[PDB]
Amino acid sequence: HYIGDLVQRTEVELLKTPNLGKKSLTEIKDVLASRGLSLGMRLENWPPAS
Amino acid sequence: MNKEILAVVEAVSNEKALPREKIFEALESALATATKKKYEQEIDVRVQIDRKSGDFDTFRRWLVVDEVTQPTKEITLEAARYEDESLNLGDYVEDQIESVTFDRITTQTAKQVIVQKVREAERAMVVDQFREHEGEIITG
Amino acid sequence: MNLTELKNTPVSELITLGENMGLENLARMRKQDIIFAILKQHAKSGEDIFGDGVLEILQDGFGFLRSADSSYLAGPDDIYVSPSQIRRFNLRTGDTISGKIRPPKEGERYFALLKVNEVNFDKPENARNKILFENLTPLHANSRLRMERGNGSTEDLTARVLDLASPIGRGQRGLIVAPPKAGKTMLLQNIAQSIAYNHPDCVLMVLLIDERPEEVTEMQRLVKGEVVASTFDEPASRHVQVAEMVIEKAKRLVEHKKDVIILLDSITRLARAYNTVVPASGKVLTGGVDANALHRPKRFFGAARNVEEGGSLTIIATALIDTGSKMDEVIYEEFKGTGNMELHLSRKIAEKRVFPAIDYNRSGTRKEELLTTQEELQKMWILRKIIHPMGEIDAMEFLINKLAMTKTNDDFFEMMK
Amino acid sequence: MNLTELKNTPVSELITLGENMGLENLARMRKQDIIFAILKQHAKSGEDIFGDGVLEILQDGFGFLRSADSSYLAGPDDIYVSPSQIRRFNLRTGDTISGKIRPPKEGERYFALLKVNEVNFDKPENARNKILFENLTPLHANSRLRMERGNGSTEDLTARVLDLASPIGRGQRGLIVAPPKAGKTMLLQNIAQSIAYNHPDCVLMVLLIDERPEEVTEMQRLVKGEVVASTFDEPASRHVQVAEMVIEKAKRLVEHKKDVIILLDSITRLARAYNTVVPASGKVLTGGVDANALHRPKRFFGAARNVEEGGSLTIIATALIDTGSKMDEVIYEEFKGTGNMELHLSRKIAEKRVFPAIDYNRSGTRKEELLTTQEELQKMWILRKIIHPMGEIDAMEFLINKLAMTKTNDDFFEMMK
Ligand SMILES: Nc1ncnc2c1ncn2[C@@H]1O[C@H](COP(=O)(O)OP(=O)(O)O)[C@@H](O)[C@H]1O
Ligand SMILES: Nc1ncnc2c1ncn2[C@@H]1O[C@H](COP(=O)(O)OP(=O)(O)O)[C@@H](O)[C@H]1O
Ligand code: BEF
Ligand code: BEF
Ligand SMILES: [Mg+2]
Ligand SMILES: [Mg+2]
């Protein structure tokens, strides 16, 4: 649900998920990393504070 | 349409000073630059206009590296199990098809890059045909 | 699922399989369309596919894996592979590949290979370390391919007579010179049956080029192994396509140390096809035939050889004469002495309606002491000397009677002593 | 009203029918225009129409139901059907359909089908469950089509001689090799009469391609069943249209387990037509003929086969030789050995003005032991051996005398014993 639950996840765990082909994956990688960040990173301060 | 492509490949002055293969290579570069200028994101594409049998069909090159910047042209060197790659490098996809190659800005950039490519090819050929006579006295 | 188990079954099996899959009325589509729909329905349940196809490349770069259902032509069942796999696993035309494949994904329309499993019935390790065909050294045949069955039925004559008329060896360059409507069809049927019974190890191959569908189905239900065919329902394009496919398949097999024996019929039709497809180079000779158009048949007849370390490629092609076409005449003329084995059939004996009809004095094998033993060769010499003075019909009746009182060739041998 | 009852009547009947309908002077319009006007007048009284037409599809998607009055061409009597009906009832070209139709409604100009009643003389249930033609398995003929009438009149000779010259079987691939002005017209008339008398169950079909209208009308009033024809009043377009129409009709019939026997004359004109319509692919051979232009005649001759479970498609096509056209020569050359039945007629015997004029030694059937019994085959062998040494004119006179003293073939058989 949260974005922080997705930034700590490499794209290797996406194409294996069903209904994630070309259009969906392309749209995700476009509208997620164009904001400066990227998909797949290692952090520990999550989720503060929920 | 592709009939216009055939007309412009058969209507060149220097027909063999720029062969049909290199004609269509320059046209593919034109269409790639046009599609690049279309989207705000940077993504390399190949055209493969199908010189004689059919029309063009844009593609999407990945340029496989371990980077992530503009992931439109990024994919890891190990993504090879799903989408049927079984690859290490050179993994490229064919996702987007049938772009527009006849609007105003596309035609403008195509004309510009075709002029550039034809002048470059003519200069290169006219210099290479004399390169074989290196170390000789020439008139002119 | 596996594709071959959809291959070997007839159309009614596909009908009931689609009915099991809860599919629309599918009696209207091609067999390959039914296979495509069934594979899509099976993979919709989250399943992978297993396929097998002979590989073919165009200048476009990518490759296509065809099946034997359409005699290696384009279809909804063939698999599309990227040039990357060809570059990596060192693939080339004729290399039959079996492995995991998937139905066409989003935007795709043909199957795609996932993981190679068997490259020409071999692991990719030694498949990548394959000796080149033209880089090999040809030899001659010592391994004698015995044509005698040993059962001695009514038709086995046409086989055993060759044991005294034209010896057969592995990698032999054989050509049949025969008029139409003489008995070549049953002749090649007999030869295929005999080689399959006596030598089941060597992969059988039969070439049906420019033929009628009845002969196609009769030969696809009588040969003791996988067969390929091609009727005249398509132009010479299909003919040249299947010729290249089969020649590269045989080349890859013999590179994998296989024993291939191709039976081609008829070669004049292949020449006509190659003439029709190849454009005129500006020079034509008598017969309306281009000069260098026969280069492809030439090559196809030259592919036969004997590998040194192991394996062989025997080619036995039939040619049509006495058809009245002077073109055909010239064709046979080009094929005067290109092969080291001649099987001459004459219409004069076949008009007397005795079978087979062998031209003993006109047929023979060059350098035949290297094929059989010494006593067999001496007895062949004795038989040739006995058959030379007499004619052809009397000689044929004599041979038929002598091989009718006896069953194995040793009896006729000792009876000739 | 029904359309077929307007079909079978001549022009004067339509004249008096229109006069009954209180119509303007209609002697000026085409028969189909008269039928259209009469159907409009009948439906103006609040009536529905009943029609029957063979179906044809273009790339436009929708279908047209043609009648045999114009030999399946466009006309004001043909019915227009939407692609929806073709998608629903699984329709295709050649599928003759009979059922309820209405005159063209407001803004329309051709008839439209309301409810299908008979799909190839069958309910839509089993019509939708139709086996595909090319998906079938060809076979050979055991059902012998007896050409002997048994009455033994003056002309029945030309039929009974075939009973000893060229046996006819269901699904046989037969071709006639004959010069012009030799007697092929009356020959096919005889064969049609004989097959209709001895086998009235099989639907008769005769192909009149590129012929004169007198022959058209003489054959449309002598064949014992429905016939199709095509004169040279239109270019090769009509010829190729009727060729496709008849081939798809025969295919749909044999898919409905029918026995179709098509008589084509002449096949060289069909080849000329297919050459004229098909554009040049950039390669031409000797004779001014394109390479892959003969693909359509090839296919048309390859459509003949024998169905396993039931039904057959026999094709008997005549070819023209000795015309002096080298083009025609090459055409016959392409048709050298594509068929398993040859009927050779020679101008040399026909110049001696005896009929028929059979080339016994040149004509024959391949694999004929599967057609007739054993004693008949042995007697055929005996007759062939007796006729081989002698020539052709003397042999023809001998056969004519022997079959003139006797009536049935058993008498000639026992007389040859
Ligand atoms: N070994 C044989 N025994 C019996 N009949 C034979 C034999 N070989 C040929 N025939 C005869 O030949 C005929 C078919 O010949 P075919 O296969 O058409 O020759 P081709 O293939 O050369 O045209 C058959 O009717 C058959 O009776
Ligand atoms: N079996 C026969 N009995 C009687 N007359 C015949 C017979 N065969 C041919 N003829 C005569 O020979 C002529 C044949 O000419 P035609 O049929 O136009 O040539 P083609 O045989 O090429 O069709 C006809 O006028 C016909 O009267
Ligand atoms: F079988 Be035949 F020789 F065409
Ligand atoms: F009818 Be004839 F053979 F011109
Ligand atoms: Mg044969
Ligand atoms: Mg005639």
Side-chain angles (χ1 to χ4, degrees), chain C residues 338-350:
Chain C
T338 166
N340 45 37
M341 202 283 301
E342 293 86 1
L343 218 120
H344 281 273
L345 281 150
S346 101
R347 194 194 303 184
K348 179 177 302 178
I349 303 171

PDB file of all heavy atoms in Angstrom, chain C residues 338-350:
ATOM      1  N   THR C 338      27.831 -37.312 -62.557  1.00  0.00           N
ATOM      2  CA  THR C 338      28.117 -36.641 -61.297  1.00  0.00           C
ATOM      3  C   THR C 338      28.072 -37.576 -60.097  1.00  0.00           C
ATOM      4  O   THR C 338      28.685 -37.266 -59.069  1.00  0.00           O
ATOM      5  CB  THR C 338      27.130 -35.491 -61.075  1.00  0.00           C
ATOM      6  OG1 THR C 338      27.201 -35.055 -59.712  1.00  0.00           O
ATOM      7  CG2 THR C 338      25.710 -35.938 -61.393  1.00  0.00           C
ATOM      8  N   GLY C 339      27.377 -38.706 -60.200  1.00  0.00           N
ATOM      9  CA  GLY C 339      27.267 -39.660 -59.112  1.00  0.00           C
ATOM     10  C   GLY C 339      28.036 -40.931 -59.420  1.00  0.00           C
ATOM     11  O   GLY C 339      28.253 -41.273 -60.584  1.00  0.00           O
ATOM     12  N   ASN C 340      28.449 -41.631 -58.366  1.00  0.00           N
ATOM     13  CA  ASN C 340      29.213 -42.863 -58.503  1.00  0.00           C
ATOM     14  C   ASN C 340      28.339 -44.112 -58.459  1.00  0.00           C
ATOM     15  O   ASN C 340      28.875 -45.226 -58.438  1.00  0.00           O
ATOM     16  CB  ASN C 340      30.294 -42.938 -57.419  1.00  0.00           C
ATOM     17  CG  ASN C 340      29.775 -42.552 -56.047  1.00  0.00           C
ATOM     18  OD1 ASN C 340      28.642 -42.869 -55.688  1.00  0.00           O
ATOM     19  ND2 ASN C 340      30.606 -41.864 -55.273  1.00  0.00           N
ATOM     20  N   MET C 341      27.018 -43.955 -58.444  1.00  0.00           N
ATOM     21  CA  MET C 341      26.104 -45.089 -58.483  1.00  0.00           C
ATOM     22  C   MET C 341      24.978 -44.766 -59.451  1.00  0.00           C
ATOM     23  O   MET C 341      24.322 -43.732 -59.312  1.00  0.00           O
ATOM     24  CB  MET C 341      25.532 -45.399 -57.095  1.00  0.00           C
ATOM     25  CG  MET C 341      25.025 -46.826 -56.932  1.00  0.00           C
ATOM     26  SD  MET C 341      23.420 -47.157 -57.691  1.00  0.00           S
ATOM     27  CE  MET C 341      22.376 -45.985 -56.832  1.00  0.00           C
ATOM     28  N   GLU C 342      24.750 -45.649 -60.417  1.00  0.00           N
ATOM     29  CA  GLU C 342      23.689 -45.477 -61.398  1.00  0.00           C
ATOM     30  C   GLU C 342      22.706 -46.635 -61.299  1.00  0.00           C
ATOM     31  O   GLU C 342      23.106 -47.803 -61.312  1.00  0.00           O
ATOM     32  CB  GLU C 342      24.249 -45.394 -62.821  1.00  0.00           C
ATOM     33  CG  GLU C 342      25.085 -44.157 -63.091  1.00  0.00           C
ATOM     34  CD  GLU C 342      26.534 -44.343 -62.700  1.00  0.00           C
ATOM     35  OE1 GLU C 342      26.888 -45.447 -62.239  1.00  0.00           O
ATOM     36  OE2 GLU C 342      27.321 -43.384 -62.856  1.00  0.00           O
ATOM     37  N   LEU C 343      21.420 -46.307 -61.196  1.00  0.00           N
ATOM     38  CA  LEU C 343      20.344 -47.300 -61.235  1.00  0.00           C
ATOM     39  C   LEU C 343      19.511 -47.011 -62.479  1.00  0.00           C
ATOM     40  O   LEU C 343      18.699 -46.085 -62.493  1.00  0.00           O
ATOM     41  CB  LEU C 343      19.490 -47.262 -59.978  1.00  0.00           C
ATOM     42  CG  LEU C 343      19.021 -48.623 -59.467  1.00  0.00           C
ATOM     43  CD1 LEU C 343      19.545 -48.876 -58.056  1.00  0.00           C
ATOM     44  CD2 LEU C 343      17.500 -48.745 -59.536  1.00  0.00           C
ATOM     45  N   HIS C 344      19.715 -47.803 -63.526  1.00  0.00           N
ATOM     46  CA  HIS C 344      19.054 -47.565 -64.802  1.00  0.00           C
ATOM     47  C   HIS C 344      17.826 -48.455 -64.940  1.00  0.00           C
ATOM     48  O   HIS C 344      17.938 -49.683 -64.951  1.00  0.00           O
ATOM     49  CB  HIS C 344      20.021 -47.813 -65.958  1.00  0.00           C
ATOM     50  CG  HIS C 344      20.967 -46.680 -66.208  1.00  0.00           C
ATOM     51  ND1 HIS C 344      20.649 -45.611 -67.017  1.00  0.00           N
ATOM     52  CD2 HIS C 344      22.226 -46.454 -65.763  1.00  0.00           C
ATOM     53  CE1 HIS C 344      21.668 -44.772 -67.056  1.00  0.00           C
ATOM     54  NE2 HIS C 344      22.638 -45.261 -66.305  1.00  0.00           N
ATOM     55  N   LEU C 345      16.657 -47.826 -65.048  1.00  0.00           N
ATOM     56  CA  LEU C 345      15.401 -48.510 -65.315  1.00  0.00           C
ATOM     57  C   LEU C 345      14.976 -48.185 -66.739  1.00  0.00           C
ATOM     58  O   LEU C 345      15.076 -47.033 -67.171  1.00  0.00           O
ATOM     59  CB  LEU C 345      14.313 -48.073 -64.326  1.00  0.00           C
ATOM     60  CG  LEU C 345      14.324 -48.672 -62.920  1.00  0.00           C
ATOM     61  CD1 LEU C 345      13.754 -47.677 -61.925  1.00  0.00           C
ATOM     62  CD2 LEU C 345      13.530 -49.963 -62.876  1.00  0.00           C
ATOM     63  N   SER C 346      14.512 -49.191 -67.475  1.00  0.00           N
ATOM     64  CA  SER C 346      14.103 -49.005 -68.860  1.00  0.00           C
ATOM     65  C   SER C 346      12.619 -49.294 -69.020  1.00  0.00           C
ATOM     66  O   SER C 346      12.083 -50.219 -68.400  1.00  0.00           O
ATOM     67  CB  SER C 346      14.904 -49.902 -69.806  1.00  0.00           C
ATOM     68  OG  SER C 346      14.159 -51.049 -70.173  1.00  0.00           O
ATOM     69  N   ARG C 347      11.959 -48.492 -69.860  1.00  0.00           N
ATOM     70  CA  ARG C 347      10.542 -48.705 -70.130  1.00  0.00           C
ATOM     71  C   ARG C 347      10.310 -49.935 -70.998  1.00  0.00           C
ATOM     72  O   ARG C 347       9.210 -50.495 -70.989  1.00  0.00           O
ATOM     73  CB  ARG C 347       9.937 -47.469 -70.800  1.00  0.00           C
ATOM     74  CG  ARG C 347       8.412 -47.467 -70.822  1.00  0.00           C
ATOM     75  CD  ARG C 347       7.852 -46.427 -71.783  1.00  0.00           C
ATOM     76  NE  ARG C 347       8.325 -45.081 -71.478  1.00  0.00           N
ATOM     77  CZ  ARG C 347       7.928 -43.984 -72.117  1.00  0.00           C
ATOM     78  NH1 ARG C 347       7.043 -44.067 -73.101  1.00  0.00           N
ATOM     79  NH2 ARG C 347       8.418 -42.802 -71.771  1.00  0.00           N
ATOM     80  N   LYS C 348      11.325 -50.369 -71.748  1.00  0.00           N
ATOM     81  CA  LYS C 348      11.143 -51.517 -72.631  1.00  0.00           C
ATOM     82  C   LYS C 348      10.860 -52.788 -71.838  1.00  0.00           C
ATOM     83  O   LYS C 348       9.982 -53.575 -72.209  1.00  0.00           O
ATOM     84  CB  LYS C 348      12.374 -51.696 -73.520  1.00  0.00           C
ATOM     85  CG  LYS C 348      12.291 -52.885 -74.463  1.00  0.00           C
ATOM     86  CD  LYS C 348      13.516 -52.954 -75.357  1.00  0.00           C
ATOM     87  CE  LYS C 348      13.671 -51.679 -76.167  1.00  0.00           C
ATOM     88  NZ  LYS C 348      14.887 -51.714 -77.022  1.00  0.00           N
ATOM     89  N   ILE C 349      11.588 -53.004 -70.743  1.00  0.00           N
ATOM     90  CA  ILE C 349      11.348 -54.190 -69.928  1.00  0.00           C
ATOM     91  C   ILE C 349      10.066 -54.034 -69.119  1.00  0.00           C
ATOM     92  O   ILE C 349       9.292 -54.987 -68.975  1.00  0.00           O
ATOM     93  CB  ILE C 349      12.559 -54.468 -69.021  1.00  0.00           C
ATOM     94  CG1 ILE C 349      13.829 -54.633 -69.855  1.00  0.00           C
ATOM     95  CG2 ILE C 349      12.324 -55.722 -68.192  1.00  0.00           C
ATOM     96  CD1 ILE C 349      15.088 -54.703 -69.022  1.00  0.00           C
ATOM     97  N   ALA C 350       9.819 -52.836 -68.585  1.00  0.00           N
ATOM     98  CA  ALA C 350       8.602 -52.595 -67.819  1.00  0.00           C
ATOM     99  C   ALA C 350       7.348 -52.725 -68.672  1.00  0.00           C
ATOM    100  O   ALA C 350       6.272 -52.998 -68.130  1.00  0.00           O
ATOM    101  CB  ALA C 350       8.652 -51.210 -67.173  1.00  0.00           C
TER     102      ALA C 350
END
